[PDB]
PDB file of C-alpha atoms in Angstrom:
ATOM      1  CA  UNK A   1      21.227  95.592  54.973  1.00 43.34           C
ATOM      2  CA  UNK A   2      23.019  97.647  57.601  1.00 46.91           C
ATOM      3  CA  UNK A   3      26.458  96.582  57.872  1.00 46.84           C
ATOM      4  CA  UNK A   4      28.502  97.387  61.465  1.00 43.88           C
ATOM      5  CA  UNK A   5      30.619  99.863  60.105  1.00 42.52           C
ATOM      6  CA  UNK A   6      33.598 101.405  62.067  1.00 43.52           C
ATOM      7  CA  UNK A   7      32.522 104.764  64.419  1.00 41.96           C
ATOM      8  CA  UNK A   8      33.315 107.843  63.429  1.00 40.80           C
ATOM      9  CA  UNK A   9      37.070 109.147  63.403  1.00 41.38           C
ATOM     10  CA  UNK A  10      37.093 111.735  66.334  1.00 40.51           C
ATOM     11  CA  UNK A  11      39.278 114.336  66.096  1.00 37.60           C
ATOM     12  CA  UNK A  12      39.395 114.698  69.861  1.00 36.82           C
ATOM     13  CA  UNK A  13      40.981 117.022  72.156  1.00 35.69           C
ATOM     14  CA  UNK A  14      41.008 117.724  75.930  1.00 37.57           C
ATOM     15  CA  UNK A  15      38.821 119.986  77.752  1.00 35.60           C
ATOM     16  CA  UNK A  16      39.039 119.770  81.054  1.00 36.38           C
ATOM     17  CA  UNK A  17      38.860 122.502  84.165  1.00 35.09           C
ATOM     18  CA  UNK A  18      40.869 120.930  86.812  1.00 34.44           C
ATOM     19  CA  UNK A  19      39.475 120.980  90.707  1.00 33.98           C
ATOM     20  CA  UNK A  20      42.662 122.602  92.205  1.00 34.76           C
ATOM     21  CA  UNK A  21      43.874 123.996  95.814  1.00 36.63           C
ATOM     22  CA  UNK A  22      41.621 121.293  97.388  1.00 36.82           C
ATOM     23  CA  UNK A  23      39.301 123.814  98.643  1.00 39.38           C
ATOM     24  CA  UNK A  24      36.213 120.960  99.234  1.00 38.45           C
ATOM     25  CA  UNK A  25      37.619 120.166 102.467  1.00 38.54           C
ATOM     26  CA  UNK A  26      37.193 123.753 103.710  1.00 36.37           C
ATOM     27  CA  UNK A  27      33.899 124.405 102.801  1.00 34.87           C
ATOM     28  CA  UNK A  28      31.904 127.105 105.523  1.00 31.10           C
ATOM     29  CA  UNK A  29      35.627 128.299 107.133  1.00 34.15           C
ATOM     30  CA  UNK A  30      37.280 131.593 107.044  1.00 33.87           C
TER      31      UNK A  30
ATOM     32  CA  UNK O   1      -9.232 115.194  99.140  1.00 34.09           C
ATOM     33  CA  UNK O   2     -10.325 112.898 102.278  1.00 31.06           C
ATOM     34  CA  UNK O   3      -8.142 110.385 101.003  1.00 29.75           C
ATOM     35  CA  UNK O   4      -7.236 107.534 104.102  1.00 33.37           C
ATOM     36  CA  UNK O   5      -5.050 104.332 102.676  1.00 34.28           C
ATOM     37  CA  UNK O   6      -6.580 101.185 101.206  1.00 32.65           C
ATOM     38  CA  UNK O   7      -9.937 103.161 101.942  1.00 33.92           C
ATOM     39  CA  UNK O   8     -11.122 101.792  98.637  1.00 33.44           C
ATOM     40  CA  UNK O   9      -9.892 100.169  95.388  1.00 33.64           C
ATOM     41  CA  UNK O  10      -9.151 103.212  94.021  1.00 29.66           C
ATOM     42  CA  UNK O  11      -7.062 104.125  96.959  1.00 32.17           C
ATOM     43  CA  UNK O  12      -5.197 101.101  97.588  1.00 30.55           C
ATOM     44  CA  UNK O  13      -1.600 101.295  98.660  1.00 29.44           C
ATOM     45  CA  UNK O  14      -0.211  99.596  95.832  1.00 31.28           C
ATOM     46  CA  UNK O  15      -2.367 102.145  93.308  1.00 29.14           C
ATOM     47  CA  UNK O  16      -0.183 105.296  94.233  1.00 30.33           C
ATOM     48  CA  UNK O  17       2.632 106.878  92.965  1.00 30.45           C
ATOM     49  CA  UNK O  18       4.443 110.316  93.262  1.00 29.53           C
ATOM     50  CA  UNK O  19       6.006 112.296  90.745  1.00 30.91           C
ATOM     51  CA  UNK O  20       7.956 115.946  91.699  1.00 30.64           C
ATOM     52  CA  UNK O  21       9.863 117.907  89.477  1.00 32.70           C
ATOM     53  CA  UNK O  22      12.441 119.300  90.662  1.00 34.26           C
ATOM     54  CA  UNK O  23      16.228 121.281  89.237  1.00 35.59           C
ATOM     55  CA  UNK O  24      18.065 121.685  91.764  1.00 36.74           C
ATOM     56  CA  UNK O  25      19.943 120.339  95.026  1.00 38.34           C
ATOM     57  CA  UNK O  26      21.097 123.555  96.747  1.00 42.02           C
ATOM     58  CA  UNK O  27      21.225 122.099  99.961  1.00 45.99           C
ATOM     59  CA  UNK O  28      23.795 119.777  99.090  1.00 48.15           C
ATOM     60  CA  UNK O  29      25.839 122.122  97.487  1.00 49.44           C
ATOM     61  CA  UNK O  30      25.857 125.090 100.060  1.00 47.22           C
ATOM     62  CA  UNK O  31      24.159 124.056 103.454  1.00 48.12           C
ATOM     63  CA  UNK O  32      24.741 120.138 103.872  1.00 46.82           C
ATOM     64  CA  UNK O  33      28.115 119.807 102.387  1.00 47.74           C
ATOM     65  CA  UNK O  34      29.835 122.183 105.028  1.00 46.84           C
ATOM     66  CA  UNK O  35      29.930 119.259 107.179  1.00 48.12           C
ATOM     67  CA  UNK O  36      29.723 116.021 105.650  1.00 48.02           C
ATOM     68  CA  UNK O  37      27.178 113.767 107.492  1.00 48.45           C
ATOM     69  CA  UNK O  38      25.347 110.229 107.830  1.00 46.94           C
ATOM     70  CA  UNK O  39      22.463 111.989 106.435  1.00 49.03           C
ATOM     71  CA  UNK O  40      24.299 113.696 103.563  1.00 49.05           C
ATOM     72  CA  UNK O  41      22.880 111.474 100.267  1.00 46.11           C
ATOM     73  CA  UNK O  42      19.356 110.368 101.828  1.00 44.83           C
ATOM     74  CA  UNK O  43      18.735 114.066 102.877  1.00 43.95           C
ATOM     75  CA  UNK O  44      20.310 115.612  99.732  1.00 43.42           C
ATOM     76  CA  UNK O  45      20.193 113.710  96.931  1.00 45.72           C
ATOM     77  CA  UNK O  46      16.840 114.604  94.823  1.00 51.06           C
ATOM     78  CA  UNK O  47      15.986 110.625  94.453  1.00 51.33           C
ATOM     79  CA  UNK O  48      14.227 111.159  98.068  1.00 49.40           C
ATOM     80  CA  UNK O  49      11.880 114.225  97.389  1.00 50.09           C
TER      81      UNK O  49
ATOM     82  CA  UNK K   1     -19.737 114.758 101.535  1.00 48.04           C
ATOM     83  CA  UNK K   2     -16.311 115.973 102.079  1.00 49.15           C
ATOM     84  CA  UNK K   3     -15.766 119.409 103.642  1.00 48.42           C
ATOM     85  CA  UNK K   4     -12.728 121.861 103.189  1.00 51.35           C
ATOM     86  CA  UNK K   5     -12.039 121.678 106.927  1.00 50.35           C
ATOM     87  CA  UNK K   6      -8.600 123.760 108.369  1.00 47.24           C
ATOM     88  CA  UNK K   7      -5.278 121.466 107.663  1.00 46.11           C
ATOM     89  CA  UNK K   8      -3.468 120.035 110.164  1.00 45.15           C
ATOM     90  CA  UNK K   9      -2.324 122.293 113.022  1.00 42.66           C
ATOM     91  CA  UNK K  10       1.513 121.189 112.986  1.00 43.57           C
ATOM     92  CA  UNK K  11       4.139 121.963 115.342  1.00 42.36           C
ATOM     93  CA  UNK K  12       6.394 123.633 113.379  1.00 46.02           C
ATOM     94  CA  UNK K  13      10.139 123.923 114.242  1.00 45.23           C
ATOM     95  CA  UNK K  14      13.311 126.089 112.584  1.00 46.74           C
ATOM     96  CA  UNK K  15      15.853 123.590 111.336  1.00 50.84           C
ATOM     97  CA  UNK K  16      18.554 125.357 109.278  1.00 50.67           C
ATOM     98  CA  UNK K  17      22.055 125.255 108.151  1.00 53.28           C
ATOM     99  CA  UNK K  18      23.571 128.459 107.899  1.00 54.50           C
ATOM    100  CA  UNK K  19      25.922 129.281 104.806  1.00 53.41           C
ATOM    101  CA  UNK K  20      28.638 131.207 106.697  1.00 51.55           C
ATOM    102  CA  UNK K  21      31.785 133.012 105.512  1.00 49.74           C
ATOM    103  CA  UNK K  22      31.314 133.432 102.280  1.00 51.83           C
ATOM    104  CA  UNK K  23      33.213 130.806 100.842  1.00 49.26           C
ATOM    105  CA  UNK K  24      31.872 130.520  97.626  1.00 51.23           C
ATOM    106  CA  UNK K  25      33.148 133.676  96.244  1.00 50.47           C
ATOM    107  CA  UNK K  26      36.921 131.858  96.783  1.00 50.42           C
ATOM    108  CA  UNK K  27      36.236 128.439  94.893  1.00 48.84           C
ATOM    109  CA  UNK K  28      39.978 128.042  93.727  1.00 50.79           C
ATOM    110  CA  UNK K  29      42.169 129.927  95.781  1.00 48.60           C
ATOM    111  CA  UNK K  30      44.373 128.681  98.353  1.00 49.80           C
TER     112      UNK K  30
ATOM    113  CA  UNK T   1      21.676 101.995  63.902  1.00 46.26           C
ATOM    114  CA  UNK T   2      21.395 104.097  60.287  1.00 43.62           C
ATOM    115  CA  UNK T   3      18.861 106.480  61.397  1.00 44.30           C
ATOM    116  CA  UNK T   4      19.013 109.340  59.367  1.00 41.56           C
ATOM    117  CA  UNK T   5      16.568 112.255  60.541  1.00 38.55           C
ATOM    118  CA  UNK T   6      13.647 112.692  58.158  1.00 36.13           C
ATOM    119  CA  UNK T   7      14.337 109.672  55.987  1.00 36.38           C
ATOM    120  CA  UNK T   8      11.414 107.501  57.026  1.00 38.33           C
ATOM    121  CA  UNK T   9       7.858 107.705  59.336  1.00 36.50           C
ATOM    122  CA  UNK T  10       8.906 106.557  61.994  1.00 38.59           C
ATOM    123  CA  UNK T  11      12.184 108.932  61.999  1.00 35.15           C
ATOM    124  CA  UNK T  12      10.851 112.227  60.894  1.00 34.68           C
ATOM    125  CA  UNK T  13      12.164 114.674  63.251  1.00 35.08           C
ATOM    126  CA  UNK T  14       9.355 116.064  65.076  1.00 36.66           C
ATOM    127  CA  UNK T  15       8.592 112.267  66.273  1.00 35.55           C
ATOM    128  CA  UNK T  16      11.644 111.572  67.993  1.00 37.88           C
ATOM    129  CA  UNK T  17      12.137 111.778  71.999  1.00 39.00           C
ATOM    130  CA  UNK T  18      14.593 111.981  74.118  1.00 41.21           C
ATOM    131  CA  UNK T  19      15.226 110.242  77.668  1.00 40.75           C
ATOM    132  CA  UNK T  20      18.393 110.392  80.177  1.00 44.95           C
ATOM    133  CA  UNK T  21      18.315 109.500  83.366  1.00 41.69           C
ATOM    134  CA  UNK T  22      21.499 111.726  85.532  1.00 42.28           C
ATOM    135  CA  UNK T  23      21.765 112.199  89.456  1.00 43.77           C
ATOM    136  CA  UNK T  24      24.537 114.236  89.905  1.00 43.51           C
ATOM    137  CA  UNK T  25      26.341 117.651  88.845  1.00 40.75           C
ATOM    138  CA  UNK T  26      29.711 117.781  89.621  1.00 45.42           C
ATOM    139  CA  UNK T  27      30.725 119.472  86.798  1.00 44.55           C
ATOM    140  CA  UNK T  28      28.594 122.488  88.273  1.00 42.76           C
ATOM    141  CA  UNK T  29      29.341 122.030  92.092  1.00 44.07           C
ATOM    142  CA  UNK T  30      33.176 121.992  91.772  1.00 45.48           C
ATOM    143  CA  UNK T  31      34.842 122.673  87.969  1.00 47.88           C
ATOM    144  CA  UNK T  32      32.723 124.552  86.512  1.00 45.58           C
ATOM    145  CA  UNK T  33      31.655 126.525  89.581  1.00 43.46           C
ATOM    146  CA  UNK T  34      35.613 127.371  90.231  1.00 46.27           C
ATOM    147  CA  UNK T  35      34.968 130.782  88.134  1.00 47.39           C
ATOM    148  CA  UNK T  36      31.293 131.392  87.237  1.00 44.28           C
ATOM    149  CA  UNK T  37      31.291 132.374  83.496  1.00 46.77           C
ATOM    150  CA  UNK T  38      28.815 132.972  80.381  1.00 48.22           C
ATOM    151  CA  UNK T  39      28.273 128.806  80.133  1.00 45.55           C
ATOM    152  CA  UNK T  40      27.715 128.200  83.554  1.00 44.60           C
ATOM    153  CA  UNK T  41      23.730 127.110  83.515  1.00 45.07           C
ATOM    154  CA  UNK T  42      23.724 125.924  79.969  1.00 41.69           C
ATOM    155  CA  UNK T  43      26.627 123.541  80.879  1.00 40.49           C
ATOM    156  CA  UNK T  44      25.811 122.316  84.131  1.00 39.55           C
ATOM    157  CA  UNK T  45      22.132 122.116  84.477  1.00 43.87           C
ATOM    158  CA  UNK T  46      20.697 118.582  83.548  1.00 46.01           C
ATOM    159  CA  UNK T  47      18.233 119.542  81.700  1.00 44.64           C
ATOM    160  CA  UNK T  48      20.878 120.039  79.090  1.00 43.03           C
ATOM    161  CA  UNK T  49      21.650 116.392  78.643  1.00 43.33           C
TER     162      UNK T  49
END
Protein backbone atom coordinates (compact mmCIF):
# COMPACT_ATOMS: atom_id res chain seq x y z
CA UNK A 1 0.00 0.00 0.00
CA UNK A 2 1.13 3.54 -0.73
CA UNK A 3 1.34 5.43 2.34
CA UNK A 4 1.10 9.63 2.11
CA UNK A 5 4.48 10.21 2.92
CA UNK A 6 5.91 13.76 3.62
CA UNK A 7 7.23 15.77 0.13
CA UNK A 8 10.49 16.05 -0.53
CA UNK A 9 12.88 18.36 1.64
CA UNK A 10 13.70 21.29 -0.82
CA UNK A 11 16.71 22.84 -0.45
CA UNK A 12 15.35 26.02 -1.98
CA UNK A 13 16.78 29.24 -2.88
CA UNK A 14 15.67 32.45 -4.66
CA UNK A 15 15.95 33.19 -8.21
CA UNK A 16 14.36 35.94 -9.18
CA UNK A 17 15.14 38.93 -11.95
CA UNK A 18 13.36 41.84 -10.59
CA UNK A 19 11.16 44.24 -13.16
CA UNK A 20 12.94 47.54 -12.16
CA UNK A 21 12.88 51.42 -13.35
CA UNK A 22 9.16 50.88 -14.23
CA UNK A 23 9.86 51.15 -17.80
CA UNK A 24 6.17 49.33 -18.85
CA UNK A 25 4.55 52.55 -18.59
CA UNK A 26 6.80 54.07 -21.28
CA UNK A 27 6.59 51.66 -23.79
CA UNK A 28 6.89 53.33 -27.76
CA UNK A 29 8.45 56.93 -26.18
CA UNK A 30 11.77 58.46 -26.64
CA UNK B 1 -14.39 23.06 -50.24
CA UNK B 2 -18.08 24.51 -51.04
CA UNK B 3 -18.80 24.16 -47.57
CA UNK B 4 -22.23 26.57 -46.55
CA UNK B 5 -23.45 25.95 -42.65
CA UNK B 6 -25.91 23.26 -41.59
CA UNK B 7 -25.79 22.42 -45.46
CA UNK B 8 -25.84 18.81 -44.38
CA UNK B 9 -25.29 16.52 -41.36
CA UNK B 10 -21.91 16.46 -41.89
CA UNK B 11 -21.75 20.17 -41.90
CA UNK B 12 -23.87 21.08 -39.12
CA UNK B 13 -22.94 23.96 -36.90
CA UNK B 14 -22.58 22.08 -33.88
CA UNK B 15 -20.10 19.39 -35.91
CA UNK B 16 -17.16 22.00 -36.27
CA UNK B 17 -14.31 22.85 -34.49
CA UNK B 18 -10.98 24.81 -35.05
CA UNK B 19 -7.68 24.04 -33.96
CA UNK B 20 -4.43 26.65 -34.78
CA UNK B 21 -1.15 26.31 -33.53
CA UNK B 22 0.36 28.98 -32.76
CA UNK B 23 3.95 30.32 -30.39
CA UNK B 24 3.79 33.46 -30.17
CA UNK B 25 1.87 36.85 -29.27
CA UNK B 26 4.14 39.55 -30.75
CA UNK B 27 1.55 41.92 -31.10
CA UNK B 28 0.93 42.14 -27.59
CA UNK B 29 4.29 42.46 -26.68
CA UNK B 30 5.58 45.17 -29.21
CA UNK B 31 2.61 46.76 -31.24
CA UNK B 32 -0.60 46.60 -28.88
CA UNK B 33 0.98 47.19 -25.58
CA UNK B 34 2.34 50.77 -26.54
CA UNK B 35 -1.00 51.95 -25.73
CA UNK B 36 -3.04 49.92 -23.59
CA UNK B 37 -6.61 49.54 -25.03
CA UNK B 38 -10.31 48.06 -24.67
CA UNK B 39 -9.24 45.72 -27.26
CA UNK B 40 -5.91 44.76 -25.68
CA UNK B 41 -6.75 40.85 -24.33
CA UNK B 42 -9.59 39.95 -27.01
CA UNK B 43 -7.24 41.22 -29.84
CA UNK B 44 -4.00 39.87 -28.27
CA UNK B 45 -4.35 37.14 -26.29
CA UNK B 46 -3.83 33.78 -28.51
CA UNK B 47 -7.24 32.18 -26.91
CA UNK B 48 -9.04 34.25 -29.90
CA UNK B 49 -7.03 33.05 -33.05
CA UNK C 1 -19.50 19.13 -58.89
CA UNK C 2 -17.55 21.70 -57.14
CA UNK C 3 -15.24 23.98 -59.14
CA UNK C 4 -11.96 25.80 -57.96
CA UNK C 5 -13.55 29.16 -58.76
CA UNK C 6 -11.29 32.66 -57.80
CA UNK C 7 -11.69 33.43 -53.79
CA UNK C 8 -13.36 36.15 -52.61
CA UNK C 9 -12.39 39.56 -54.02
CA UNK C 10 -11.94 41.42 -50.51
CA UNK C 11 -11.45 44.93 -49.82
CA UNK C 12 -8.41 44.93 -48.25
CA UNK C 13 -7.25 47.75 -45.89
CA UNK C 14 -3.62 48.60 -44.01
CA UNK C 15 -4.22 48.47 -40.28
CA UNK C 16 -0.90 48.66 -38.39
CA UNK C 17 0.75 49.65 -35.25
CA UNK C 18 4.02 50.95 -35.70
CA UNK C 19 6.91 49.92 -33.18
CA UNK C 20 8.59 53.34 -32.86
CA UNK C 21 11.71 54.49 -30.98
CA UNK C 22 13.34 51.71 -30.33
CA UNK C 23 12.49 51.04 -26.95
CA UNK C 24 13.24 47.64 -26.60
CA UNK C 25 16.90 47.89 -26.78
CA UNK C 26 16.48 50.02 -23.16
CA UNK C 27 14.28 47.40 -21.15
CA UNK C 28 15.78 48.43 -17.66
CA UNK C 29 17.18 51.69 -17.77
CA UNK C 30 15.76 54.72 -16.42
CA UNK D 1 1.40 8.81 -6.44
CA UNK D 2 4.66 6.17 -6.39
CA UNK D 3 5.23 6.17 -10.00
CA UNK D 4 8.55 5.21 -10.63
CA UNK D 5 9.57 5.42 -14.47
CA UNK D 6 9.98 1.98 -16.02
CA UNK D 7 8.71 -0.03 -13.07
CA UNK D 8 5.44 -1.25 -14.53
CA UNK D 9 3.33 -1.29 -18.21
CA UNK D 10 1.55 1.19 -17.82
CA UNK D 11 4.65 3.50 -16.59
CA UNK D 12 7.39 2.56 -18.93
CA UNK D 13 8.80 5.70 -20.12
CA UNK D 14 8.14 5.92 -23.68
CA UNK D 15 4.21 5.67 -22.70
CA UNK D 16 3.93 8.60 -20.67
CA UNK D 17 2.47 12.15 -21.93
CA UNK D 18 2.54 15.26 -20.97
CA UNK D 19 -0.26 18.11 -20.92
CA UNK D 20 -0.16 21.91 -19.55
CA UNK D 21 -2.36 24.26 -20.34
CA UNK D 22 -0.39 28.23 -19.93
CA UNK D 23 -1.68 31.65 -21.46
CA UNK D 24 0.76 33.96 -20.61
CA UNK D 25 4.68 34.81 -20.65
CA UNK D 26 5.61 37.32 -18.46
CA UNK D 27 8.63 35.95 -17.51
CA UNK D 28 9.70 36.60 -21.29
CA UNK D 29 7.86 40.00 -21.92
CA UNK D 30 9.32 41.84 -18.87
CA UNK D 31 12.17 39.83 -16.53
CA UNK D 32 13.63 37.88 -18.58
CA UNK D 33 13.50 40.18 -21.60
CA UNK D 34 15.28 43.06 -19.29
CA UNK D 35 18.80 41.72 -20.79
CA UNK D 36 18.43 39.11 -23.56
CA UNK D 37 20.92 36.29 -22.67
CA UNK D 38 21.94 32.53 -23.68
CA UNK D 39 18.44 31.16 -21.79
CA UNK D 40 16.21 33.49 -23.19
CA UNK D 41 13.94 31.04 -25.62
CA UNK D 42 14.56 27.92 -23.65
CA UNK D 43 13.20 29.76 -20.53
CA UNK D 44 10.45 31.68 -21.74
CA UNK D 45 8.84 29.90 -24.55
CA UNK D 46 5.86 27.62 -23.42
CA UNK D 47 6.62 24.97 -25.09
CA UNK D 48 9.12 24.42 -22.36
CA UNK D 49 6.60 23.72 -19.67
Amino acid sequence: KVLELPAYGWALKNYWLQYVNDWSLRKGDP
Amino acid sequence: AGVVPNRTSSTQKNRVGVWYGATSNDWMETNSAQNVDTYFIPGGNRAFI
